[PDB]
Paper text:
Here we report the investigation of the role of protein flexibility in the modulation of binding kinetics and equilibrium thermodynamics of drug binding to heat shock protein 90 (HSP90). HSP90 is one of the most abundant proteins in the cytoplasm of eukaryotic cells, comprising 2–5% of cytosolic protein under non-stressed conditions. It is a ubiquitous molecular chaperone intimately involved in a variety of pathways, including cell signaling, proliferation and survival, and protein folding. The N-terminal domain of HSP90 (N-HSP90) contains the nucleotide-binding site, which has been the target site for drugs interfering with ATP binding and ATPase activity. The unbound N-HSP90 has a highly flexible lid segment comprising residues 107–14137.
For 7 of the 20 compounds, it was possible to obtain crystal structures of the complexes bound to N-HSP90 with loop-in and helical (8, 14, 16, 18, and 20) conformations of the α3-helix region (loop- and helix-binders, respectively). The main difference between the structures is the conformation of residues 104–111, which can adopt either helical or loop-in conformations. In complexes with compounds whose R1 substituent exceeds one atom (compounds 8, 14, 16, 18, and 20), these residues have the helical conformation with an adjacent hydrophobic pocket lined by the side chains of M98, L107, F138, Y139, V150, and W162. Steric clashes between the ligands and residues 105–107 would prohibit these complexes from existing in a loop-in conformation. All ligands occupy the ADP-binding site and form typical interactions, which include hydrogen bonds of the 2-hydroxyl group of the resorcinol ring with the side chain of D93 and with a water molecule that generally mediates interactions with G97. In contrast, for the helix-binding compounds, there is a large favorable entropic contribution to binding, and most of them have a binding enthalpy penalty. This switch in thermodynamic profile is thus directly related to the conformation of the α-helix3 region with compensating differences in enthalpy and entropy of about 60 kJ mol−1 between loop-in and helix-binders. Protein flexibility is another possible contributor to favorable binding entropy. As previously mentioned, the N-HSP90 crystal structures show higher B-factors for residues 103–111 in the helical conformation, suggesting greater structural flexibility of this region compared to the loop-in conformation. In the helical structures, however, the Q23-N106 interaction is not possible due to the binding site rearrangement, and this may contribute to enhanced flexibility of the helical conformation of the α-helix3 region. on can vary significantly, indicating transition state destabilization playing a role in prolongation of residence time. Helix-binders reach up to 230-fold slower association rates, when compared to loop-binders, indicating a higher transition state energy barrier for helix-binders, as depicted in the right-hand panel of Fig. 6.
Numbering used by the authors: 16 to 223
Write the structure that this text describes.
């Protein structure tokens, strides 16, 4: 049921740098995840213009932010296009290669970690605040999958046996013990207002 994969070497190196570099401006992770969700929503909306049946798995196009102080998790849910098994295992990592290599050269040349998004590898900034990331996804052309990594050079993929989601992606950030400020309603609002006022889909913050 569970398959284990090695990350592409350059991605493993980037994740180690993100985990081991002293860097205080950690809030940039939320902008990057919301941006990816917005891109996934644009993709399904676009495909639905030539094939309306693409929305049979759900018409609502939105992003939900769900902090959970008890489990110490921050969940980002979207009803975008989702990802196939091939996306999770190889295809997204393949397209990220040049950006990953360029970003690491930029960091060696004195660039700031906040520039990560300009290199298309913004997702990995989640490892500034998360000890583990679980991703539950469902694409119209494939089954529901659960991807997971605590970094350390590998990730896993399994078919998800949990509640079916219809379509989209759920990113569950298992936060580090000293990063619980990202579970506070006022902190999430401050970040979203500062880094995300040009997203064309409703972002709803779930109150505990
Ligand atoms: C969950 N991850 C990290 C990861 C671990 C394994 C594979 O990806 C993400 O980056 C991520 C991906 C999507 C997504 N669904 N469909 C699709 O095309 N994308 C996508 C959109 C913009 C850039 C890249 C993308 F893939 C999303 O909606 C939210 C996300 O936070």
């Amino acid at each position: 049921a569970v398959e284990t994969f090695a990350f592409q070497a350059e991605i493993a190196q980037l994740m180690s740098l993100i985990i081991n570099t002293f860097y205080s401006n950690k809030e940039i992770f939320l902008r990057e995840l919301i941006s990816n969700s917005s891109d996934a929503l644009d993709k399904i909306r676009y495909e639905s213009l030539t094939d309306p049946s693409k929305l049979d798995s759900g018409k609502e196009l939105h992003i939900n932010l769900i902090p959970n102080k008890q489990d110490r998790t921050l969940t980002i849910v979207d009803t975008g296009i989702g990802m196939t098994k091939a996306d999770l295992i190889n295809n997204l990592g393949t397209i990220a290669k040049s950006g990953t290599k360029a970003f690491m050269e930029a960091l060696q040349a004195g660039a700031d970690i906040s520039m990560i998004g300009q290199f298309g590898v913004g997702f990995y900034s989640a490892y500034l605040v998360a000890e583990k990331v679980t991703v539950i996804t469902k694409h119209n052309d494939d089954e529901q999958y659960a991807w997971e990594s605590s970094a350390g050079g590998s990730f896993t993929v399994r078919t998800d046996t949990g509640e079916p989601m219809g379509r989209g992606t759920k990113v569950i950030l298992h936060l580090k013990e000293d990063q619980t400020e990202y579970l506070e309603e006022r902190r999430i609002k401050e970040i979203v207002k500062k880094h995300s006022q040009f997203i064309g889909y409703p972002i709803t913050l779930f109150v505990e």
